[PDB]
Ligand binder design. Structure first.
Ligand code: M97
Length: 298
């Protein structure tokens, strides 16, 4: 209850360029007993977004508690509300933002019945077939192909960041500042800057330079496929951050899951090429995986 931002000192050209994303206080209903889920990420609430023709839209609402002042609000708008006007069936897009005077800004996302892709496939109550799992990988590849075309570098591609709707359409999400805290199991922390680093998903060059590209998104996509075909097993479970790096430097890789098609494993191994320029583009991945999915019977 200490967050105050003076909306009127926001750059007038920035507030013009983002006004179509801003939701008014009376156009979003949020009941605070109605929680979709809780975690390290914070608390995600049920919301109802009210359009102009009495059309009610079910959404998920989250306070961006990491945004505490005008400076951070500005940066967030300059990187998040321009720089994320995306529209693709396999990309989770922002429904809008509540800019508040008192309190952190709210983000409003489409409701996703089946939650994150990792938890869904780990749940033995569900039965995604081998073909279904490749189909999920295919859907992610298409979302990533779209994002690469927009020159958007995700940086945190992983099964936990892909969401599943009620029709089982996979949407690639980027919760930028939306995650309050990050699980120690998956994210290392940089001592000096506080940067969160998803080491077991990072390309070899990123483990060295801390720099991300589309080609490092391709590496992470390989790991995501591995996650899919193992039904959400943790990559490199026994192993610390230094030993993972040595493992990879030796040219060792994640091992072929049971029931994973050989052609699909070849694709994974190509994603983990040590030379970034030698990894497949997402165009190549969508082509390759589409054929694997289409011709999959056995
Ligand atoms: O984008 C989304 N839409 C939804 O409905 C959220 C959701 C569905 N089941 C859940 C079960 C537990 C928590 C959330 C959900 C999902 C989300 C995940 N995370 C993960 C980290 C931070 C945020 C913030 C907003 C929305 C979501 C979100």
């Amino acid at each position: 209850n200490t967050v105050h931002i003076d909306l009127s000192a926001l750059n007038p050209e920035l507030v013009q360029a983002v006004q179509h994303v801003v939701i008014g206080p009376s156009s979003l209903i949020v009941h605070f007993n109605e929680v979709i889920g809780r975690g390290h990420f914070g608390c995600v609430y049920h919301g109802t977004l009210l359009d102009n023709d009495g059309k009610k839209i079910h959404c998920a609402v989250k306070s961006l508690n990491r945004i505490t002042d005008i400076g951070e609000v500005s940066q967030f708008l300059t990187e998040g509300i321009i720089m994320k006007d995306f529209s693709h069936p396999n990309v989770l897009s922002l429904l809008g933002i509540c800019l508040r005077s008192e309190g952190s800004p709210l983000v409003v996302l489409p409701y996703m019945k089946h939650g994150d892709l990792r938890n869904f496939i780990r749940n033995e109550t569900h039965n995604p077939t081998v073909k279904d799992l490749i189909g999920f990988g295919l859907q992610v590849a298409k979302g990533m192909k779209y994002l690469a075309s927009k020159k958007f570098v995700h940086r945190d591609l992983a099964a936990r960041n892909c969401m599943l709707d009620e029709k089982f359409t996979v949407k690639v999400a980027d919760f930028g500042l939306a995650r309050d805290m990050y699980d120690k199991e998956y994210y290392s922390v940089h001592n000096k800057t506080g940067a969160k680093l998803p080491v077991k998903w990072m390309a070899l060059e990123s483990l060295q330079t801390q720099k991300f590209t589309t080609k490092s998104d391709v590496w992470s996509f390989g790991v995501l496929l591995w996650e899919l075909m193992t039904r959400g097993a943790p990559p490199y479970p026994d192993v610390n951050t230094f030993d993972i790096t040595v493992y990879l430097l030796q040219g060792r890789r994640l091992l072929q899951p049971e029931y994973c098609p050989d052609p699909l494993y070849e694709v994974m191994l190509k994603c983990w090429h040590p030379k970034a320029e030698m990894r497949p583009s997402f165009s190549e991945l969508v082509s390759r995986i589409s054929a694997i999915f289409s011709t999959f019977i056995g």
